[PDB]
Every structure is written in structure tokens, then in C-alpha cells.
Write a protein that holds these residues in place. Structure first.
Motif, short mmCIF file in Angstrom:
data_model
loop_
_atom_site.label_atom_id
_atom_site.label_comp_id
_atom_site.label_asym_id
_atom_site.label_seq_id
_atom_site.Cartn_x
_atom_site.Cartn_y
_atom_site.Cartn_z
N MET A 147 0.27 36.61 101.76
CA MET A 147 1.47 37.19 100.97
C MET A 147 2.83 36.87 101.76
O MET A 147 3.58 37.67 102.17
N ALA A 148 2.92 35.65 102.32
CA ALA A 148 4.09 35.28 102.97
C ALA A 148 4.47 33.82 102.92
O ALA A 148 5.63 33.76 102.52
N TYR A 181 5.66 30.00 102.05
CA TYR A 181 6.05 29.41 100.98
C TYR A 181 5.80 27.76 101.42
O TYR A 181 5.28 27.45 102.19
N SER A 230 4.49 21.09 96.34
CA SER A 230 3.84 22.56 96.61
C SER A 230 2.42 22.23 97.33
O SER A 230 2.02 21.22 97.19
N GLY A 231 2.01 23.41 97.82
CA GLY A 231 0.85 23.16 98.78
C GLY A 231 -0.40 23.53 97.99
O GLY A 231 -0.53 23.26 96.83
N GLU A 232 -1.42 23.87 98.97
CA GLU A 232 -2.75 24.10 98.35
C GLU A 232 -2.92 25.22 97.51
O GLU A 232 -1.93 26.02 97.30
N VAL A 233 -4.27 25.72 97.15
CA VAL A 233 -4.38 26.69 96.06
C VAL A 233 -5.03 28.05 96.94
O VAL A 233 -5.52 27.76 98.03
N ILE A 234 -4.40 28.90 96.78
CA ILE A 234 -4.50 30.31 97.38
C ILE A 234 -5.67 31.20 96.62
O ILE A 234 -5.42 31.04 95.23
N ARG A 235 -6.50 31.79 97.26
CA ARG A 235 -7.72 32.34 96.82
C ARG A 235 -7.56 33.85 97.08
O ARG A 235 -6.75 34.28 97.70
#
Lengths: 335, 474, 474, 335, 49, 49
Positions: free
Chosen positions: F1-2, F4, F10-15
Motif C-alpha cells: 500500500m505505498a 505509485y 502504469s506498472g504490474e499487477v498487485i496481488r
């Protein structure tokens, strides 16, 4: 992919910084912050003779008007494969619905998103009013130091000379140091919010403990603010004239968690210091063609067709919040 | 498949207005790409209005104390005036100057069918070619949005400014978008004038209370879109793969362990074996000419072929699927397909006349439901103008003033399409029974026949006298 | 499948009210997404009311001692007044100012069909364009909940405040929710005034005692929802897999023990064999161009292929499943599908007229069951207002006062849709038999024909005299 | 995203190379150039006896038939955030329209695009007829040298032996060198187009200046070509028999600008030399399924949904223009 | 104006490349004059005074 | 949770960030009792026994 209007929170619970010192929002239709463009403080004294009137007064041309806002646009997936946060027994049959699961999971996702931008904004705030310097930085991005201009007397240190730890724990009164650091603050100080162990060695002095009033003696809406955010702001009580607070907020970084606050620090200033929330352009075709180039935040729910054929929630913002008067707060590292 | 089309679970008005633009846009897409909408609107036109839409003024003589003979003569005067004013040959009755009364009713009914609403505006024309300075300009539904496309609000709701009780005060007409580069500006338009004058005739059918817009089409036509797509694609695949044929070459060769050892030796250091075999096979195909038909067999050296083993081979069932679904949506949308695309399959006599009479009565329903509003509104405006101009004379014994009893004075009915013909024997036995038992009046006889009793009697007088004079048999 | 829809085992009222919101919401979903509900409500409209709903006032002259001629003349006066008051062309008879009497009956019957109940309120309009200051505003069923959405209580039960005996005292009307952001506040509304005045006309059909709400639709329509879904998906799969084809490449190779030893040696240390074979096969596919049709064969080096062996291949049976179930639910819900989507399959003469007459009599049943309530209630309110205003004169010999004998004085009947046509020969032979044997009266003859005996006789007088004058044949 | 047909320019103003020497376009349905496939010059002499006729004549199997076309597909954004090129006072209200701004900005974008491919094609042309070698090269791409086969006598140099700078500025006549380099050109030379200072030291000789005719004496359509492209081709005049031209065209590279032409160079040849414009495959799914695999250029306007949720104009081409006869031009570096 | 992308997919979005200094004051010049009809004017030769 | 992403893409996928230990046995408790109508029960004061 759900509409823009599905962005209802009514949850604005920032820790007393962006809501109390930094109310002064300036979203722009332009990329950078142009402090010359912001009127800020207005040239506010001169009159004209009782015959005619004088020249035209402008926004008084801020010397530095070029910094890069933190355009933050994260996202997440709301893939209906999880069991979600089940509030106690409100008919899990609607969770069994993909429609309700997807809508309240975009609710959960987006709320995580704005609290993420809020916590990074609070780190920006703590950097700002603790040193006057902010690190506009990130990988694949040049680190720009954004300085409000905090002066040296606003960075004077307690360890210099005699330390409170290296003092009498019973007879010494740190109030003398309190006005010593408050005098060069360009105003009156009415909150003495500490980090935890900072307040610990502050109160270790007896004079502090029989000088402070534990009673409510409700001075202002700060008690209401503490009742709202009973999480990490702790209204210790009255020190008589001034309010004693302790902030123990924590940010949970990539693999670990740690407090926002450094070991032992203080900022002496007013509760009504002027805080700017300049906001840059929002780089989203939707935002431009509907006029949200100048705003606070932008959510969206949207489907990718093709290789990542999925659906995501995207949050975009660009804050560059600073303080109008860096000299308003004296930043002291403690014993 | 439910992904590209999504219903919310809520009251219909709040379930349609948020997705108004998308549904209406895909409705435009299907009514433009598809012939069914054109056929349906054409048949609705020819059943509701048909040739023309005839006015008949019947002021409430009994209630107002007006004599029936004076009412009938005053109606004669107003009917002559209205027919001569409507028959303008220069298309001049519209502000656009390109539509007569017929196409007033045409566009109004078409748009009240598509979007469920129609928007007429009574404007004051200045063209002095006619006695009546009132024209009626029709207003697009794209124009009605909140001032500057803002979302719905407390009382400003999708372009209509109402009270808490819902009373439609006025509207925000966005500026026209043709050519495709005019900006929209929203202008205030009240629904009606306080004196009862019908300025902005907003006729729509609300399915529930508080609803502001009418009914759609696409939100029940996406399934024809995707059935036509799937039947189209499946016929294409069936046609292209009834005789797809693989033309490769295999050989005996294939000495298992020996072939594997040769391949491994080639991979390691003995590619000369593969080069020699490829040369021999190239010489093979260039000394054979390996050719099947009019075309050359695609070059395949031995040991590789396609395995075009297929999927299941049952009948597609699309036949009874499509008949069942066409059936289905045909007396869904309302007009039967055995004429929306005209099948004559196993249809019988009771079939024909039962279907015809129920469908025609149901079109009479739609006509009396979505035509009489526009007819009465336009007639009221025109009659108000006529009273202003003293074209026709109101009865002297008027129990109520014109402005007070516009509904009573301007009471009117209208006649749609002409004389129905389905069987012949049917209509004629009905006619003989009615004319012998007296079970038909002037008004409903003329409604059934699309004529007028006064003119049929005058022309029968003319018939009899000309037959007597010329020597014919009356 | 019984999981997403669950019946409790209890009395119907306590089995529906707890799940009232979910059932009604999914009913909204299906009536919005599906055309069947629209067709059914449209046909119910056109069979029950049709063109119009005609009032006929028959005060109990025999019981009240009133002369029949005075009753008939007083009825003439009240009928003229009611028709002229109802024919208001400005839609002004409603508080919403956008519905006439026709759409009063329309929305009332539609909502009493959907939710089983309708809510009318007699309010005092101030608009002086008409003599009668009473309008009738219809009230949404979402409004009736307990004060502040509280669950059912002892005597406050789903919004209605009743006694222990069940007598409906009043109601808690929640505030409107359009726009979608108004809060709801609950307001007290009594069912009727003590003097017999019909303030809150709450007409619903209770299936059992103590029931407060009407009947649903979705709780018998979920099965169409899921049958249409399953037939839709199964047709999609059938269409997409009639000619799905696997295009891979196999070879002879495969020297069992040698291939296994080569693979094991590659896994251990001899991957150069696999690299060499892959290079040879890549050169193979780039020197062959292994291409089947218009498209390239997807790259498969030897030794791997898909096994698209299928499931059972019997006919799906969906044909007779769907005919049986459409049959089934068609004369379940009540209106037959051979017109709700119009099949003409093997339908015959006795078929047609038997089905038509039974269905039409059954619609006469529904009409007389769920229309006369609203008609009589509205007529009673309007007649009370007329007596207040002294528009029509009550008989001087009134055996009972108006307030005492509102039921006796305001006794009325109503006429729905127009003259039924099915066969022609049928109606005409019936008519000739009735008119020869005298087996038909004024009232039931006019009920059968949708006309009036007084007007047919007056217009026959006019017919005969005009034929005599113009020279025609009476 | 606007349709394919919104690609109307009527602006073909290439500097006399791709329009006058290299008219010979060959777009293919196949990737490479196959010079064996091109007929080029046909075997064009032999007849047969007056009894029967002979064998079948083919495309005479070009020895080298494998080079990589320069598949160039650039793009740009036409984001309606700019104020655009405002032609003088044609109702800026339509510029205020997003529709008109977007359409004429895709006009501007795409025209920049084809003039970009045209200028890179002109650099290819100048490499081609100045050394016979072309560098098919780019980062993440192997440099293929595409050689037409320019001979050594086509690369003979003026500085070798006696230089024109190292000659009499008054009496020496460089016409002798003119036919000396023209004789081994496999044809007649009728344009002596120089780079600027090359023509400067050419004309420094008096014999040149009283041998040249400044008059029009309009020989061909080259005057019309100069009137069309009055930008960088300069019709100096007649040298009597031959036309004198100077090309001073310039390309504006990534950070700087510089002339196409080297310091002092010349190519002696005809105006009707045969120039091939072989064109490779166009790698665009739209192009293949509508049959534009064999064409000159392909535009498109198209929206990206997702991370780069925007809208772009994309231009795709694949030229490998060369010269049929490299020996046709003698390439000389001057004094 | 140089980089391309690999022959598999395409790359990121290219912007106006963020000029370092973007803040100067234009010379807003607004002069005026009078055209009071009290002068004899520039008389082009003999076009009907 | 930090984290950007840059203002270009935009970046990768968060799991769900892969908890290290994800295997413990829940206390599946299933008791029962009898409600045999042989007892006199808890009689709330005088509500009609």
C-alpha cells in the motif's frame, strides 16, 4: 467496467494535516505548480490619496513557480474470484452475486487507493513540516527537491548544547526551551504534538507533569478531531496554556511497517498555518475530454481487451502540497 | 455474454437514465444497420395514420348548451379551414419549411416510438403566405439534457426542471449538433403557457410515476444482433469447411529406431543426411510433378501431415432454434414475423383472420394511444389561433368562454388509416347486418369505412339525379 | 439451482413479505430485460380497458323510491359532466399534471398487476381551469414501509398501521427516491375518511386473510430467465463447435525406447539433441511453409497433438422441452403463447374460437375484478365533489341522504374495451337471434356491442330522416 | 479514432528524386525485395526464324533478390489539448470544437508523418545515388548494406590529381572534367545539380561564368519542378548544353539540423534513370485483412483502452527504394 | 523523434517532452490613439477630397 | 500500500501478498444436545404455562 459516479465514500479521515493545515487546494489545468500564479498572500497594506486611485494590483509574482506534482496513478484488479470482506451477516447471497461482489469490491479497492494516496501525501506532509524539503522522487524519474524555504532557526536542535536527557529529570522545566523555539516561529504555537518517546522524555520532567492539566477544558475542535481519528492522534491533555498531542501514525511499506514520525522530533507552529494543495494535470483522455484536467482525484473502472483481457480500477491524482510559510514551524530534533 | 450488456437492479427509470446514451446509441446502430426497424416503423405508420389523419371537431354541445346543428355547422367551417390550411403544397407549415402535417405526424410518431417521447413547439412564423402565423417545429430528444450536460440533480433531472412533486415546469434545450461541430448551449423552454396555451407539446408514455423518458428498442434487440451474427458466422464456417482438403505427402520410410538415430545424428553432426534426403525429395517432386488437379500439391517432403480430425457432427439445430426465437420475439416486439418477413408456412384460414383482426385492433389501440395526443394538441393550438383571427365564429350562447373551455370547445377525434380489407365476405356481411339492423351510427359507420355520411348522402343524391337525367338506373 | 431462489414453508403472506424486496427487484429486472411482461401488460390493457373505460350511473331507483325516468335523466346529466371533465386535453386531471383518466386507469391496472396493489390519493388541486378541485395522485408501492424502514411490528406491519383485528387504519408513505438521492421520510395517510370519503384508495387482491400485499410475477418467472439463459448458451456452444478444428503436426519418429532415452539424456545433460531437433523442425516449417488454408498452421513440432474426442451425440431434445414448457407456462401465467409469440402451428377452427372465447371471458373476469374497484372509487369521489358543487341535482324524493347512501346513489357500472371481433359469422348470427327472440336487453346489448341504445335510436332517427330528405332508402 | 478515408493530402512534393528518378514503385505482398521477381530490364533483342517460334522468356532471374525493406511505422498523439495551427481567421469557433480540432490535428499529424518518411526516404536516395551503398540500419536491428553495385569509375574523385581549387580560377575550364566524368556514366548527363559550395567553386572559374546562360531557354519541365519546389532546388540556369541546378535541402535531426548533401559532391547521370521503389509487407492486422499488405502507405486513427488509454495516429510503410543502374551516375567528391 | 518499438507490441505514450523552463511574461502591449475629426489627413493625390 | 507509477504508463499487477504461513486447522466444533420433552423448563414469570 462501472461508471464514474460509482465513487461514493464519504470517508475523509486524513490525520489532521491535509484537513487542518493544508486546506488550500489548487488543482490546475496545467502540469506544474506556478507559485507566481497562486495569489497566496496578497500585497495588503497600501491605500491611495483622497483625490484619485492608484495602479492595478496583481498576484505578486512568486519567485519560484516551477515544481513537478506527484502524478500518482495506481490501479488494482477487482476480479470476482475472492471471498470479500463480509460485514457480519448482511445476507451473503448478494456476495454470491457477481454484481454485488464486483461493486463492493471496487468500493474496497478504490478506498484502499485513496487511503494509499492519503498516506503518501501524509509522508509528504511530514517531510514538508519537518524539514521544509520534499523529495519529489521515484524510479524512472529525476529527484526534484521541492523546498518551501525552511530557515536555520526553524531547524535548531535540542541536542545542541544541553540535552533534555542530559538534564535534571525532576527540577528542570523545558517550558523555557518551549518559548525559546516558539519565539522564532512567526506566530503563536498552540499544539505541541510529539512523537511518542519525544513526549516521553518531555514528560519525564516533573515540572511538566504538575504543570500539565489532564482535564478536558475543551479548548477547540481538536477534541472533536481526536474523537474522529482516535487511531493515531492522542490528545494527552492541557499543558495549561498549550495543547499536548502525540502522533504515532504508521505507514506499512512494501515489506515492513514503521512510524511516519522519526525518533524524536517537533514542529512548533500554529493550527491555522497556510497549506497549499496545488494539483497538476490529470493524464487521462477521459479526464481531458470531460474537463477533469483540474481536479483532486479521478477514479475509473475499465476493461482491457486482448492480452491482459481483464478489468481494473484505476485511480489518478497529482498532488504537490507544500506549506506557504516554512518559517511558521520551528523543526527541532530532541534529546 | 452478459458482459457487454448489463442491467442494474432498480426501478426502471433509474435503471435506464444512467445508461440512456449507450442504449439509445446502440438502438441507432441497429435501426440503421437492420431492416426490421424500418419495416416496423413503416407498418406502424401505415396502420396508425396510413394515407392521412382526419380531424373531426365535436364541441360538447349537450354540456355547453350549444345546439347540435350549430355545433355541426361550426364544425363544417373549422373542418374546411383546417383541411385548406393543412393541404399547403409548399411544405410551408413547418419552421424547417420542409414538412407538411402528414410528416409532422410521421416524425412525431416515429420518434415517440423510438425514444418513447415527442417534442413539438408552437412557434410564431412570420411568412404571410397563409392566414395563420403559427407553425410547429419539432425538437430533437438529444437537446433535452441538464444545462451543460450536467448529471441529474435535485429538481433539474436529465434536462427537465420539475418541482418536488414532479410537475414538469420546463426544459433545457441544448443547441443543435448538425454540422457535427456546433457546441451545445442550453435554453429554457416551458412546457405550456399558464393560459392553457400548448407551447412545448411533450408527449411521452411513462411506464411508472416520475418517469421522464419513453421506451427503448435496443434493450430488447441486442439478441437479434448477436443471433444474426452467430448464424451468419456459423453459415460461413459451414460453407468454407464442407470441402476443406489437406494435400500433403507421406511415405513408408520411418524405420522407427533408424529414423530417430538418423535425426539425432543430423542434429549432432550429420546434417548431410538431411540435406541429401531433402535433395532427393526435391528431385522427386520435380521429376514426378506431384500435382493433384488444376493446382500444385503443396510441397511436403515425407513424414509430416495435418490431422484434420473434426468435432461432433450432429445437426446444428439452428433451424428450430431460429424458428422458435423468431416466433418468440415476433409477438414480443408485437408485429408478427409471418409478415415482418412473410412466411407462408402452414398458415390457415382461422389463422389468417384471427391474427389479422387481433393485430389490427391492437394497432387501433396504439393509434388511439399515441396519435390522439398530438392531434388534439395541434388542433387546440390551431383553433386558438383561428379564434384569435376570427376565422370561425364561436357560438353566441357559449356557456363557457373559449379560454375557459378549450377542452370542451376543442373536443375532437381523429381518423387514421383507410378502409380495412382482409377477406371481403367478412366486411360485406358485417355491413349488410349493420345496415339492416341499424346497429351502426353515422360516427362509427364512418369510423369503420373511412368516409363521411354527409358526403356519401350528397354524392348519392348526385348519383341518383345523374342516373335519372342521363337515363341510368338509380 | 434451488440455491439462488428459496421458498420458506409457511403461510404465503409471511413467506413473501420477508423476501418482498428481492422478489420485487428481480421482477423489475425481468420486466425490464424481457419483452414478455411488456406484451402481457399491453394485452391486459387492450382487453380490460382497450380504447376507453365508460361510466354508467344507475342509482338504485327501485330501492330508493326514485323514478326510473328521473334516475335516467340525472344519469344523463352526470354522464355529460363526467365525460366533459374527463376529456381534458391538457392532461390536467392529475397532480403530476401529465396523465388523463385513461392513464390513471393504465398505471393503476399495471401496478395492481405487477405488485397486486394500487394506491390512489384524492387531493385538492388549486388549479381553477376546471370546475372540480379534486385530482387523484397515484402513490408508489415503494413508499409503503414501516416508519424509517423498520421491520414488521405488532400493529405496524410493512407500513400499514392496523388493529389486532387487522382493520387498515393508515399508512406510512416514505418520501420519493427520484432523484436517486432523496432521503425517505414516512408520513401518515389514513385509508379513508370517517364520512365514507375515499381519500387513500388502496385496491389490492388478498389471496388470504390478513394479507397486505398483492401477487408477484418473478416468483414464477425465474424459470424463463434460466431457460432462456441455458438455450442461449447451448446454441452458442453448438454454433461455435460445429466446426472447431485442431491443426497440429505429428510425425513418425517416436522410436519408443530410443525417444525416451533421448529425452532422458536431454533432461540430464544432452539438451543439444533437443536444440538440434527444434532447429531442424523450425527449418522444416520455414522451408515447407506448412500452411493449410488462408491461415498458417499453428507451430507444432512433432510428437504433440490435441485429443478433441467429444461427449455424447444424441439430439439435445431442447425442441420438445421448450415447446412443452412454453405450453406449460403459457396457460400458467394465463395468456397463451400461440399469441404471446404467435405460433400458427397446426391450429384449427374449433381451436381458434374455443381458445378465443374462453380467454376473452377470462379477461372479462379480470376486468370486472380489478377495474371496477378503481372505477367506482373515482366515480364516488367525483360524484361527492359534484354534489358539493351542485353541478348535478339529486332527486328531491331522496329516501336516503347522499352521504348516507353514497353506495346506493353512486351505484355504477363500467364498459371496457370495444366491440369484440373474432369470426364475424359468430357475432352476426348471435345478433340476429337476439334481435329476433328479444333475448337481449338495452343494457346487455350495449355491453355486447360497446354502444348506447339511446344514441343508436337517435342516430337511426337521423338516418331515416336524412335518407327520406335526400332521397335515399331508410 | 477516425476512419481510414480521412487521409486526404493532395500534397506530393518530394524533392525531384522519388518523383523523377525513382518512379518505379513495387509494393509487394511479401516481406523482402526479390529483384529476381522484378522484371526490371527485359531480355530484349532476340527474334526467331521465319518457320516456328522459340522458347518462353521469363523475368531474367536477378542474381541478388533478398534485402530488408525499411518498415517504418511511427505514430503521434492528436490529444485535443493544444491550440493548433490557426490559418488566418477562418472562424476559430470550429477550432473551439473538439471535432474540428481533432480532425485537422490528425491532418497535421499525419502530414508530418508522411513528410518524415519522405525525408528519411530522401536520405536513402542521397546515399543511394552518391555511393551505391545504403545502410538499412537501426537500433535493435542488424545493419544490412544494400548495394546496387556502383562501380569504381562511378566513384572517381576530383581531389585525385589536380583539384579545381588548385587550378586557375580564371582560365581553367572544368568542362573537360565534365565530359571526363560523364563518359563513364552509361548515358548522357543533363543535370549538373551541385551542393552549394560545390557549385561555388565550379562557377569560380570564369570560363564557367561566360559559358553558362542565365536565361530561361526553357528546356523541359524542370523549370516547372523548380517553380513547384522553390524551397531547396535552385535552377541556376543553362550552362549551354546542360542544366545547372543546386540542391540545398536540409534535414532536421533529433536535436540539430544539417544539409542532406555532403560538403562537395556530384552525381553525373540522366533525368530518366530507372529507380525502384520496392515496398515490403505492412505489419498491421487491418492491412492484411483488407488487403493493404501490398501498398505504399497506411494511416490509422485508433484508441488505446487501459493503461495508455488515449488515441493516436499511426503511419506504416516499408520502402527499400534503390537504383536499377548504379553505373548510371558517376559520384565525384569535389575539390 | 527517434525510438521505435519491437515487432511484437508497442511501447508507452509519448508526450510534449516537458520543457524545463515554462514561465515568462509576454509583452502585453495595448496602446491607443485618438482619431478626432479635427485634422486634415493624408490626402492621396486627388481622389475626390 | 505505498508505490505509485510514473506519469507515462502504469506498472504490474498487485496481488494478495502471499502470506508465508497459510495452513492451520480450524477448530471444527460440532456439539449437540437433546430437547426431549420430559423436563419442566425455564418458566419466565407467569406467561401462561
Amino acid at each position: 467496467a462501472q461508471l464514474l459516479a460509482a465513487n461514493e465514500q464519504k470517508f475523509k479521515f486524513d490525520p489532521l494535516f491535509l484537513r487542518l493545515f493544508f486546506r488550500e487546494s489548487y488543482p490546475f489545468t496545467t502540469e506544474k505548480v506556478y507559485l507566481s500564479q497562486i495569489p497566496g498572500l496578497v500585497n495588503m497594506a497600501l491605500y491611495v490619496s483622497p483625490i484619485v486611485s492608484g495602479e492595478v494590483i496583481r498576484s505578486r509574482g512568486g519567485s519560484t513557480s516551477e515544481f513537478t506534482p506527484g502524478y500518482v496513478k495506481p490501479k488494482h484488479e477487482v476480479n470476482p474470484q475472492m471471498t470479500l470482506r463480509r460485514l457480519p451477516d448482511e445476507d451473503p447471497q448478494n456476495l454470491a452475486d457477481p454484481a454485488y461482489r464486483r461493486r463492493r469490491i471496487i468500493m474496497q479497492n478504490m478506498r484502499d487507493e485513496e487511503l494509499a494516496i492519503a498516506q503518501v501525501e501524509e509522508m509528504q506532509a511530514v517531510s514538508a513540516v519537518l524539514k521544509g524539503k520534499y523529495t519529489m522522487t521515484g524510479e524512472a524519474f529525476d529527484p526534484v527537491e521541492v523546498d518551501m524555504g525552511r530557515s536555520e532557526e526553524n531547524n535548531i536542535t535540542q541536542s545542541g548544547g544541553t540535552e533534555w536527557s542530559k538534564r535534571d529529570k525532576s527540577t528542570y522545566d523545558p517550558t523555557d526551551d518551549i518559548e525559546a523555539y516558539a519565539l522564532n516561529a512567526s506566530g503563536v504555537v498552540n499544539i505541541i504534538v510529539f512523537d511518542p518517546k519525544g513526549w516521553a522524555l518531555f514528560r519525564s520532567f516533573k515540572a511538566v507533569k504538575e504543570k500539565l492539566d489532564t482535564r478536558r477544558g475543551s479548548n477547540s475542535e481538536l477534541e472533536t478531531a481526536v474523537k474522529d481519528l482516535g487511531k493515531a492522534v492522542s490528545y494527552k491533555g492541557m499543558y495549561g496554556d498549550v495543547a499536548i498531542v502525540v502522533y504515532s501514525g504508521q505507514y506499512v511499506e512494501n515489506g515492513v511497517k514503521k512510524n511516519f514520525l522519526p525518533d524524536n522530533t517537533m514542529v512548533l507552529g500554529n493550527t491555522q498555518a497556510r497549506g497549499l494543495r496545488t494539483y497538476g494535470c490529470i493524464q487521462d483522455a477521459d479526464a481531458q475530454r470531460e474537463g477533469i484536467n483540474a481536479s483532486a482525484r479521478y477514479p475509473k473502472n475499465w476493461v482491457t481487451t486482448g492480452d491482459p483481457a481483464r478489468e481494473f480500477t484505476m485511480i489518478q491524482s497529482a498532488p504537490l502540497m507544500l506549506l506557504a510559510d516554512p518559517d511558521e514551524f520551528v523543526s527541532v530534533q530532541l534529546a | 455474454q452478459l458482459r457487454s450488456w448489463n442491467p442494474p437492479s432498480e426501478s426502471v427509470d433509474a435503471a435506464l437514465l444512467p445508461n440512456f446514451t449507450r442504449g439509445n446509441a446502440r438502438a441507432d446502430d441497429l435501426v440503421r444497420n437492420n431492416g426490421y426497424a424500418a419495416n416496423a416503423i413503416q407498418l406502424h405508420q401505415d396502420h396508425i395514420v396510413g394515407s392521412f389523419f382526419r380531424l373531426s371537431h365535436r364541441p360538447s354541445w349537450r354540456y355547453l348548451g350549444i345546439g347540435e346543428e350549430e355545433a355541426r355547422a361550426f364544425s363544417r367551417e373549422v373542418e374546411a379551414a383546417w383541411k385548406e390550411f393543412a393541404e399547403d403544397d409548399c411544405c410551408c407549415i413547418d419552421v424547417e419549411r420542409k414538412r407538411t402535417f402528414t410528416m409532422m405526424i410521421r416524425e412525431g410518431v416515429a420518434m415517440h416510438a423510438f425514444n418513447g417521447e415527442l417534442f413539438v413547439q408552437a412557434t410564431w412564423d412570420t411568412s404571410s403566405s397563409r392566414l395563420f402565423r403559427t407553425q410547429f417545429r419539432m425538437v430533437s430528444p438529444k437537446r433535452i439534457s441538464n444545462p451543460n450536460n450536467t448529471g441529474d440533480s435535485r429538481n433539474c433531472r436529465a434536462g427537465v426542471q420539475i418541482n418536488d412533486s414532479g410537475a414538469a415546469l420546463g426544459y433545457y434545450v441544448s443547441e443543435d449538433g448538425y454540422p457535427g461541430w456546433m457546441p451545445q448551449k442550453w435554453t429554457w423552454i416551458p412546457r405550456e403557457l399558464p393560459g392553457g396555451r400548448a407551447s412545448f407539446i411533450h408527449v411521452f408514455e411513462p411506464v411508472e410515476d416520475g418517469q421522464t423518458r419513453g421506451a427503448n428498442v435496443f434493450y430488447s434487440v441486442m439478441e437479434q444482433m448477436k443471433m444474426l451474427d452467430t448464424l451468419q458466422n456459423t453459415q460461413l464456417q459451414s460453407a468454407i469447411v464442407k470441402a476443406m482438403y489437406a494435400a500433403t505427402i507421406e511415405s513408408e520410410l520411418d524405420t522407427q529406431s533408424a529414423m530417430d538415430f538418423i535425426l539425432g545424428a543430423n542434429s549432432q553432426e550429420q546434417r548431410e543426411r538431411l540435406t541429401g534426403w531433402i535433395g532427393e525429395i526435391a528431385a522427386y517432386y520435380a521429376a514426378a510433378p506431384v500435382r493433384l488437379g488444376g493446382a500444385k500439391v503443396p510441397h511436403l517432403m515425407p513424414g509430416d501431415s495435418l490431422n484434420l480430425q473434426t468435432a461432433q457432427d450432429t445437426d446444428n439445430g439452428y433451424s428450430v432454434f431460429e424458428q422458435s426465437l423468431l416466433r418468440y420475439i415476433a409477438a414480443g416486439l408485437g408485429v408478427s414475423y409471418e409478415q415482418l418477413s412473410r412466411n407462408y408456412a402452414q398458415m390457415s384460414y382461422s389463422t389468417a383472420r384471427a391474427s389479422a383482426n387481433e393485430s389490427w385492433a391492437y394497432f387501433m389501440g396504439r393509434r388511439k394511444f399515441v396519435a390522439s395526443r398530438q392531434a388534439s394538441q395541434m388542433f387546440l393550438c390551431w383553433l386558438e389561433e383561428a379564434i384569435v383571427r376570427r376565422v370561425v365564429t364561436l357560438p353566441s350562447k357559449a356557456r363557457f368562454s373559449f379560454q375557459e373551455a378549450r377542452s370542451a370547445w376543442g373536443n375532437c377525434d381523429w381518423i387514421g388509416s383507410g378502409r380495412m380489407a382482409i377477406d371481403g365476405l367478412k366486411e360485406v356481411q358485417e355491413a349488410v347486418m349493420l345496415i339492416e339492423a341499424g346497429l351502426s351510427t353515422y360516427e362509427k359507420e364512418c369510423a369503420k369505412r373511412g368516409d363521411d355520411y354527409q358526403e356519401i348522402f350528397a354524392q348519392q343524391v348526385r348519383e341518383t339525379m345523374e342516373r335519372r337525367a342521363a337515363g341510368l338506373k338509380p
